[model samples]
Structure formats: C-alpha cells, structure tokens
Target chain A: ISLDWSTEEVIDVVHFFQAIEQAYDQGIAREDLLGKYRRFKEIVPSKSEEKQLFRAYEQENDVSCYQTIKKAREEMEEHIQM
Target chain B: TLPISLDWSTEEVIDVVHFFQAIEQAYDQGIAREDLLGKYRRFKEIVPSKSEEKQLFRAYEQENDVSCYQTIKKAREEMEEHIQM
Candidate 1:
C-alpha cells in the first residue's frame, strides 16, 4: 500500500498506490500519508465490510489487490498488507 | 489487512495494530513511555520471533516511513513522562 495516497491527481487506480509506496520508502513525511491511511481504515470497522469493499474494488477494476501490493513488495526491500 | 501474519488469529491481528498505533502516536504526538511499552509488550506476544517483528516493522516503515524500531529505541531510554520519535 503506497498507501493513503493524497496526491491531487485522481488515483485509487493502483498506479497512484505503487508510486506512493516507493515514495514513502524512499522518505516521505510519515504523518501526512499514515494518518490518512488510518482514517481510510476507519471507514469500515467490520471485517466483512472491508472485504466487501475489497471485492467490489477488484470486481469493478478486474484487478487483484494482493498482486499489486505484492509487486510493490518485490520492488521495495520491505512492505505490508495493508 | 496490515503487516501482520495471515496465520495469526483475528484478535492477534488487531493487537498488532494497537502496537503500530502506539508507534504512530509516538511520532505524531508524544505517548507515555509506559503506555508504549505496554503496547510493545503486547505486540511481542503476538510476534515473539525477531524475524517476524523486523518484517512487520519494515513493512510498516516502507508504507508510512514511521519506524517502529526507532520509536521503541527512544521509548526504552527516555526518562521523561512521554516519548516522541
């Protein structure tokens, strides 16, 4: 999760996410992205709702979220799910 | 989903989040050393292995640039009421 992307550009489109992960790994202010990410997590407290969104996102886009983040993991020396 | 082991139960996963939150608080605002320590100790229970801990920390730092290891280091030695990274 290049995670909690806050760019002016529109991009929940995966491209935005990968770019930002590298940016954070290289060095970005932690508070800026992370706090937003936390809020992102807060949107759905229930695990099922989160999963529901995940499925919805992938179905609409026809992309696997895990693979995307996994790709980032390969690029960066370190990473996480979510 | 987080930098947690999939093998861990749901309770374990959330506990790990608690630990990470403490680390974030340490960086974003001051958190009491005792509180952070308590969280870290709870975290250790979830991830007793050093390798997994490193992986989890690195995973998080990669995403947010907040270093759990760095925050913990400060938490240990600080004599003040609150520790900030």
Candidate 2:
C-alpha cells in the first residue's frame, strides 16, 4: 500500500535473514541451514487461506512458502541482533 | 550468500499476492473440467529461473513443497490441460 511499508518490511527481513545468512557464511553448512529453515516452515502456522501459496509467481500470501521463508529469514536476522 | 536485501518488497509481495489471486481464479476455472489443462499450464509458467530455482526448491525438497526443474516441467503439462472458455 505504501513505500514505507516496502522499505520498513524489507529492512526487517534483511536484518532478520542476515543472521541466517551470516550463520551459513560462518561455519554453518548451507544444507543444514536450509534444512533447519524448512523445519521452521513446517512448524509455523501458515497465514495463507489455502496451503498452496508458494506456487512460485502465482500467489504470494502469508501462507505462501516463500512468504514464510522470507519472514523467517528476516526474523532470524533479528534474532541474531538480539 | 544472499545480498544485503534479498527478499521481495511489499510491491513485489503484492505481485505475489496478485499472482496468487490469478491462481485462485485459475484453480476455480480449472475445476470446470474443460479448463483444467490450461490452468495447469499457467501454474507451470511461474517457476523462477534456474539460478534462483535450486536452493528454494531444495529447502522444500524434504516436505514435497518444492521440487526442482522436473516438477516445473510436470506442472506445465498439468496446467496446460485447463486453459479457458
């Protein structure tokens, strides 16, 4: 709806994912990081009305796998910060 | 490694939202039987480029959420059966 929404949210995800990216950048294996991330996706309650939201370019909702992964990555960055 | 900012923005997010919206419509239309294959094709067209494809799909590989290029190929064939009126 607004630019602020975009910038703010992007910044949040960036900061959040940075932690994950960094962890992987460090000694964390990329495969393990992705595996853990996928596990997290399974555990989180999806916000999508239907579970098929990750249909690539088709739909990008909170329930979408991409959204969840994106959100998680961002939160991971935040977690690293704290 | 990911860039300083790699995720989609709100607008990009909205595009995904809108794209999904189209998917819902296609899904509904696809149920009509005759439109099935066409919608399936549409779904197949949405996969990202190869470079972007591998990792994302790999993450979901265990859960059966994301398969690689082959799934994309299959999805295309499945969707092609559901085009339109």
Candidate 3:
C-alpha cells in the first residue's frame, strides 16, 4: 500500500534530491550547484517513474529531500535580489 | 525503482503449460475444464502450502482460466518505513 502525490510534485522533489546528493558527493562548489540547477527542465512530471519516486519519499522520510527544495528556493531568491 | 508486474512463476507456467498440453491431449482422447482444473488444483495443494501461493494461483487461473498461468511468474516488490528505535 502506498500514498499518492501527483507526478509534478514528485519529480520536483526527485530532481531536488538529485542535485543536492550530487553536491554532497562533489563537495558544495557553487558551479556544481548552478550546473545542477539546469536540471529543472529535465524534471518532467509525465515520466513513468515520477510517482514511484514519490512512493519512495513517502516510505523513506528523508530530510535531504526537503532540504534540497529549500536550498533551490533560496537560490532563486538570491538571483531575484541581484 | 518502478514496481514490477506480477506474472506466472516458471514452474507454474511450465507445469500448467505442460498440464494444458496434457489436457489437450486428453481432450483429443475426450476430457473437459471441470476435470482438468479440479485435478490440477488438488495436485497443486501438494506443493503449495503458503496462503500467498494459493492466492497467486487463483489469480493466475482467473487471468487465464483456459490454460498456461502459474505461480512461477509471480512477482513481489516491497517498501517499508521504520521508526528509530
């Protein structure tokens, strides 16, 4: 049994985690962070695996997921200020 | 990862594929669904003690009531949440 979240919302988080996990692996370079941000358009919700990833999120209760989203939002805010 | 689809187990497909082949042979000699499904299910009871196995077989049979579906192709995927203890 699994809970449902829509595909767009799920993929948003998956890409967020992917970027943050990549940053963690590569060591927080600003270039790496911005490069990872380009992946937003790759974040299509229609992919079949989108919902499956969210099911994992529901099951896993990982903090990195929410943290990634928060970080991305902050980056957008900083860019808007500049 | 994407969840996998449930299908017949190898033994199930092989056994029933063979069973159906045998039944068709018997039908060539004169037999029917009533006899084959009933007897095969009883024979199945000998090897299938698990409730899940039985449910799988019933599902398989329901899928292809005529022939060639079994437990061997059955698939399982699991996800769980654990509390810090």
Candidate 4:
C-alpha cells in the first residue's frame, strides 16, 4: 500500500522532529517535548508507518529521529543537548 | 561516517537497526514500555560498551543531528503507564 501520509500528518511529523531538534540544539522542556510527541503519536500510531516515514525523511534530510529522542531523554540536567 | 558498520554480522546489524527503529517508533507513534525495553536490551547486547555506544552515538549525531540517549530517556519517562512511548 502507498504509505502516503496526510498533510496534517506531515505537519505533525515536522513539528515533532522540530521539537526533537530544539531539545538537542538548545534544550527543551520535558512538558513541551512530551506534548509534541503525543501529537505525533496521534498522527502515526503504527510502528510500521512510523518507520516508513522515518526512513523516507532520513533518506532526504539525513536526520535520525531515533537518536534525537534517545539523547533528549538521557539528559537529567536543566536543558537537554543532542 | 555511519555509526553502524557493514562488517558486522547481519543479525547484529539487524538488531541495531531494529533498536533504532523502535526508538523512532517511540517518538513518532508511541511504543509499549516492555517492548521498547526488550529491544534496548538486544541493542545493548550488540553494542555493550559505553565508550562504543558513545562513539556510535556521536557518529549518528554528526550526520543526522539525532541523539539516541535522549530518545531512550524520553521513552522511559513516558512508560509510566499506558500514556505513550
């Protein structure tokens, strides 16, 4: 099946990735990241679909969502660094 | 350079890939805590060294601007209940 994500889904995806970037670039609040991630889940609730999107995005942008989220969560300090 | 190498066994490579994939899923659509934890355990088995983990992580960030540590941490935080990964 064509895994074409909806426009809103795409937006949510970008927003989610942006929040992840903010976490690493300048550090983000836990609540803020949490909120964005929740929205992302709403858009892509299946692991298979999420993987396809991540694969496509990474192929085009070279950014890995896996690493971003992993790093953000590891930090215990005030601000998180990627 | 890619954090993962081609020389690694296929199974090892697949495990790492799955682990990373799971991380992405956790962020993109949410995952079960137990499931994530299980995948992470396999990842650690393949990449068991802290220094090695750091090297691979650094390599990934250099090319992708993603942080594996943060993603895993966030998942753990969200795993308190049926909320989301």
Candidate 5:
C-alpha cells in the first residue's frame, strides 16, 4: 500500500500486472505480455526495487507474479496457458 | 506462489485453492452466485484478516488480472436478489 512509486508509475505497474493476470486465466499471447513486462521493467529499472515490490506484493497476496512470468518466459508456445 | 505459509494444512490449502479457482471461474465465464459464496465463505474461514484478504486478492489480480473483489461484489448482489425473492 505504501510504495514509493508515483501515481502514473503505479498505474503502469498495475497495467503490467493486469497483463500478467490475463496470461494466467484467459491465455494471452506470449509476445504481448512479454512486451508489456519489458515496458514495466523500463519504468522500475532497478532489480532490487523490483524484487522488493515483488516480495511485498507476494507477501500481501498469495499469488506469485514471479512464477507466472517465469513460466511465461520459459515457454516456446504461441500463448501462455498458465 | 503466493506466500501461502508452509504452516497451513493440506485441507486448508485445498480450501484456499478452491476459492481462488472459483474466483477465476467467475471471471472466465459465469459461476453460480451461491456456489461462489460457499467457496468464499470457506476461504474466509481460512484467511480471517481484512488486511491479509486485501493483500491476497490484490496479489491474485497482479498474477491473473482478475478482480476477486468485483466478482465477490457481483455475487453478493446476485445473492441479495435471490434473497429478496
């Protein structure tokens, strides 16, 4: 809840998350999500801060963003089925 | 996964997972309001804290883009309709 990100940054971050979620429940094409996440990385730009956000978000919610993206990245298919 | 503690029992995990899956189901198509409410009730028994509930549901949105809150809200409204009938 208390994050250092600006409102715009938070919105972008949320958009990225929405893309991730779409990948899981509805099967988004891989390239689309990858592109969005790449944009997200550009905004955060800090591995440590990204990891910190990941940890805090994961701690608060029982869903694993890391796992979803990791699996998405690993696949060679047209769409992420997770 | 989400930081579902290792401390929880298998039954608890199953209950929680079922609840999450029910939420996803609601989003994917349409779930029976009563069925979802039943699953959510069980989910609440397992996760009692309002803070934790927000965190978990938010994480779910992050991971899957589905709004558990909206789904629950819709279900409640639908249930209220049946109740009034």
Candidate 6:
C-alpha cells in the first residue's frame, strides 16, 4: 500500500502492515499486534484515514486488515495465528 | 455533524444525535461499550428499519466522513473495557 505519509510515518505503517501479516502467517503475540495498532493509530489519527488505508490494503492483498485486527481484539488466545 | 429528519420528535432527534456522538467517540476516542451500546439501542428504537438506518448512517457519514457501520462493528468486536478505533 502506498500513501502520502512522511518518511517516519511510512516506515511505521510498513511495520504495522507486516504485523498484520505475521498475525496470519505464523501467529503473533497479542501485545505485539496491539502495540503496532496503537502506533498506527498515532500516525493515522483520523477515522477516515485509517478506514481508507484498511480498504487499500484489502484491495491489494484480498486480506482484511480490519477483520484480522477485529479477531485479534476478540480472540482470547495469546498467539493469534489467523 | 448532525443529520435530522423533519418528522422526528424532539426526543427522537436528541436520541439520534446522542447515537451519532457515541459513534464518533468510537472513532475519535475510546468509548465504553456499555455506553455506546445504550446509545445505539436508543438509535435503533428510533430507527427500526435497516434501510432507514443505512440512510441515516450515510447522511451522517457524508457530513462527517466517518462510517457509522464500521464504528458500530468495531464497538461490537471490542472485548476490552472501552472501544477505541
């Protein structure tokens, strides 16, 4: 996903998206994912901005970042592997 | 941003406004699920039909650029003490 984010913000979003992948691929710690999401929110404070980014990611990879994160939020397991 | 129907009662209007505010809080800040759920319940009482509710959501979203559907979905998914986008 590409955006108009600054250098630091782009790097952070990259980390956040990678965390999304890690959550699905090999299982990620809940705290790790939540930390990335919290930082992602800082870079994208607006609700619309985050929604747009989520849409772009889904469109590109056919993976719903929103859905994955929602599951992470709800899942009782410490290690979330999809 | 507020969207009101001409046919709504004053109380109904207030209820809808409160619901919108709660949804906004779900995005702009963390909101207690209990509080958000209560406001959403009141909003549903005022708007029983899904089509009408979507219309209201769209209008409000158009005005505010925030998705009520997404906000409510997030609130539903949230398992923590509060719902924050």
TM-score of chain A of each: 0.37, 0.28, 0.34, 0.65, 0.74, 0.84
Off by over 4 Å in 3: A1-18, A24-26, A43-61, A75-82, B1-85
**Model with the higher TM-score, candidate 3 or 4:** 4
Candidate 4 residue B71 Cα shift, in angstroms, is 29
TM-scores for chain B, in order? 0.87, 0.36, 0.30, 0.71, 0.80, 0.84
DockQ in order: 0.02, 0.03, 0.01, 0.03, 0.01, 0.02
Off by over 4 Å in 1: A1-82, B1-5
Cα error, candidate 6, residue A37 (Å): 0.4
What ranges in model 2 sit over 4 Å off? A1-82, B1-5, B14-49, B65-68, B77-80, B83-85
Candidate 3 lDDT over A1-82, as tens digits, reads 3346578756765655565555446445444455544554355333223223433443454334323433554564432111
Candidate 6 local lDDT, residue B41 = 59
Which digits, one per residue and each the tens of the lDDT, describe model 4 over residues A1-82? 4456788878888988788767657778776776777788787776445555554455456455656554455555555555
Q: Which TM-score value belongs to model 4? A: 0.42
| Recovered share of real interface contacts in candidate 3 | 0.00
lDDT, candidate 4, B22-72, per-residue tens:
666665767665556656655665576777887877766687645678867
List residue ranges in candidate 4 displaced over 4 A.
A1-9, A73-75, B1-85
Model 5 chain A — which ten-residue stretch has the worst lDDT?
Answer: A47-56
Q: Compared with the true structure, what per-residue lDDT tens digits does model 6 show for residues B25-50?
A: 87786787666765675576568777
Report the Cα interface RMSD of each model, rounded to 1 decimal: 13.2, 7.8, 19.3, 7.8, 14.1, 11.2
Query: Can you tell me the CAPRI class of model 5?
Result: incorrect
Which is the leading candidate under lDDT? 6
For residues A1-82, write the lDDT of model 1, one tens digit per residue: 1334354323433433443444435543334334434454454354333333444454445444334333443454343323
Model 2 DockQ (Cα-based): 0.03
CA shift of B34, model 5, Å: 0.8
